[PDB]
Amino acid sequence: MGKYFGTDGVRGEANVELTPEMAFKLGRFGGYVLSQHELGTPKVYVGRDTRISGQMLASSLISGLLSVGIEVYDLGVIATPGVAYLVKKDGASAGVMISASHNPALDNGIKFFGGDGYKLEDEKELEIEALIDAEEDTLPRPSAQGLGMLHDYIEGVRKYQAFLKTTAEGNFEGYKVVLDTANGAAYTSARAVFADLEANLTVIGENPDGLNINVKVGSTHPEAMAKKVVETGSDLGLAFDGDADRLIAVDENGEIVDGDKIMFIVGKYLLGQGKLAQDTLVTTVMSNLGFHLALEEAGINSVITAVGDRYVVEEMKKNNYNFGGEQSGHMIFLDYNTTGDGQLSAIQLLKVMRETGKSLSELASE
Amino acid sequence: MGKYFGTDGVRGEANVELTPEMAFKLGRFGGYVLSQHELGTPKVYVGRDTRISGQMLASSLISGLLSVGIEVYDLGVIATPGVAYLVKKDGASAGVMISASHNPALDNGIKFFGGDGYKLEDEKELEIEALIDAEEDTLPRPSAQGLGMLHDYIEGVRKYQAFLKTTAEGNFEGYKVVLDTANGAAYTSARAVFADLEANLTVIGENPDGLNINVKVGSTHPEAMAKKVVETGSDLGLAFDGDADRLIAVDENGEIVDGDKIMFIVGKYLLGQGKLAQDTLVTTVMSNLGFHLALEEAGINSVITAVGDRYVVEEMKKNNYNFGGEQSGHMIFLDYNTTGDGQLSAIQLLKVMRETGKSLSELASE
Amino acid sequence: KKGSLDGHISAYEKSFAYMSERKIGALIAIERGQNLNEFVSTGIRLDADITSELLINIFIPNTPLHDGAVIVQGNKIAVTSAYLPLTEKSGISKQFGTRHRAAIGLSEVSDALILVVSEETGGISVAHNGEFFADISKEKFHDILVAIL
Amino acid sequence: GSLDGHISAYEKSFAYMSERKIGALIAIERGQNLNEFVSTGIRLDADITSELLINIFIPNTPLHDGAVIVQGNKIAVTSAYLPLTEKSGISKQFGTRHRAAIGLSEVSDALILVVSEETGGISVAHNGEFFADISKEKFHDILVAIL
Ligand SMILES: Nc1ncnc2c1ncn2[C@@H]1O[C@H](COP(=O)(O)OP(=O)(O)OP(=O)(O)O)[C@@H](O)[C@H]1O
What we know:
The complex is a heterotetramer, with two copies of chain A and two copies of chain C. Chain A has helices at 20-34, 52-68, 80-90, 122-133, 157-168, 190-196, 223-231, 259-273, 289-298, 309-318, 342-356; strands at 5-6, 9-13, 43-48, 71-74, 94-98, 107-112, 151-152, 177-178, 236-239, 248-250, 256-257, 280-284, 301-305, 324-325, 331-332.
């Protein structure tokens, strides 16, 4: 493994583990390894979470992006799924999301994705680590014409908001929803997507604070979303994460509905509509034994691989299926998204509940 | 020049002579210097010219200064005099501007606009030199609490425009002018400013594409704006510098109006009207020796300060005088703005032409 | 007057805070006992519902709606081409332009409780119903706007 | 409708944006469907006046992104994405915003308000046909033909 980049990229404590100077080195090194195989000046996009230290590392990476000639038409508030969808529909060469996801605000996490739609492969991170760990300095510096100029893609987030609404393939009206961004990135897309869908709006922790991302609200503390959904009479409750990597569900009974129940519900709904797979949906071994037992009773074929979302993505790409999700909440619904997409997973679940009519109380039967 | 400071900040070529990492270092250690001399969180400003490679240095310094604690609100694409006026007006504790003026596109400026309102004080430069000279970077690196978010100040064009409309001192409407933007500081606010006097506007080079700054238009070869004055048939000229500080113009006949000639015209319009209450105005010996003869015939006493506006402003602060500058056209009305402002000089010349009765064909003949 | 306007109060507070960090000094209204319409009949009003983007782009300076103040009724602000009547006293602090003094005048004459962002005084202060407050916390502004919205 | 005030206000706003080089691309609908493409963006439903139009189309501002689509004697759109064109004769010197204004010439049935953000030239492509770089009196005649 790389010394800083690892499984989910590089995740270290801000101004402690990975220096911002090392980030201004890393963006340029990633550019000098990004322009290796494309033609012309390749393009990329960038997004980040709502953390206060998230803006510093993202600004440092954008500063390093103008060192090797990486033109950026980026934003600053989107999910990792948003950057993945923008990379897939934009034909660019790279995409990076700056967020530490479920951890506290004391660390930030920078990871570069793969332009095909999945994460970046082993060769990209290996060459970037080779460039960073090299003692000398060989990165070219474009002074004359050839250096790019940064641009704001603030209108570009509307594409990520519409594509999820397009991938919904049905209005989310009727089912009175209570969304839970919880100081994440869903204050930019989920509120607009639900309001356009004639749904109900009641968001807890929807205002970013800078040091409140994934702090006492969200995927690592789902108490407040369930409490507010029960108190406001929500017929359905959904919650997101800081980087929106995972997804958690708030039931009408005030209990906790987890990713295993979410995967069982999505698998049954796709079995009804005949779009699960050939016969086999991927599965992480960290799911509950009752979940896999109910899956085996349901009859859909289950495959277990190495623990980790990267292994889940590799199994999805190798096994030719169209679904994969671990019980934490990262659900690769590749029939409508390029990579892990909590918002698309919630949209598919709400459409499943609308089309099938199965109750929010009984949705966790399997 | 100190340990790492130039003449008016940092002057050099981006990613060729200066280093972008050194720019982030001069942001961070400079933020430490600014923090070690003022109680409370220091609030600063940032600005940059429209140079092609210019945005990389400004981004790197904005990222570097973002760590030290002083939350540097940034306002890109604005004049240096506009940035100084905004810093001294809104209540800033510091500021930054980036422009190289007469230099070609191969280099960009870096200027730390001090908290006084004039150019940066000696103590600030000495402190920044000390904190970039020592080996260890012992600044307090805040992890989450104390980090400074980057609040964009895109309304910075509006305040700098508002300083022009107050300095109009009456309408400049009716007359016909020519304003060569020169793909520089005039590309953002000066077109709207000269339009805001409700006159006939004929622009040259107002469609900047980054690498077109100070190329075949402006204060480097003023024959083009004069040819446009001859073809368009407007009355007076205006050809801004790189940072909207210097000023020069062509008449309705097409000749060259000197900076000392513009000084003599503004001085006659002042000493006639009694506005220059310190009537022995300052002057530079960098102009022609006959300019002082013209001043002595005009009945206005003149002193001699060294070439450049630094000692000129120093003598202006010493003997409490209002007008005095070099031959480049910095008609720095210290009772109307902060420092050298080509837009303010053009506004004063338009006021002189409006109130003096005689057009511009007779003012320069003194 | 609905829950949409109740959330629009929070949106207007967010816009005023983003103006306070950027010194976009302007004055707004929320009627509190009599109509501002007699003073709000000066210009071309809008009556569009109070949205964050509309106010945050309207109340910027050096533009076609910089002068005057914002006047409101219901869930909407009637554009910006009509300010309230200014003050008449001079025993209070003279440390502002037209904005804080004129809003305190709207407190003195009208029954208003007007949010008026300060460029001449930097922060945000509230003059309300014949009284005032200066440079209060963000939570204070949010609570006051929710209470008297 | 006798829009002797509405068209005059839109013309005055367009000329004011053109002279001072305010960059936008606005529209007012016609006798066919224009609400489905307009519902995407932010909503104001603003009362129509030239000054408010100059305010909304001010550059580098909050509502400075996206088109301005109007219905009737008022305007209701903010940053709603219009359908782009597919005709081959698109001018490269015409902007991508101007390309979007050319988008409506075959998927809508109206005109638009196209102001160049690079040179300020006039442009319009309506009813399939087009009219570009018209003067203030000429665009006034165009709007009178629109009425
Ligand atoms: N489909 C669309 N719907 C609405 N607005 C659009 C659309 N496409 C582009 N725009 C607007 O136009 C902008 C991009 O167009 P662009 O600036 O390239 O063109 P232009 O201003 O006509 O030309 P130039 O850039 O040469 O001045 C976007 O930021 C947006 O505001």
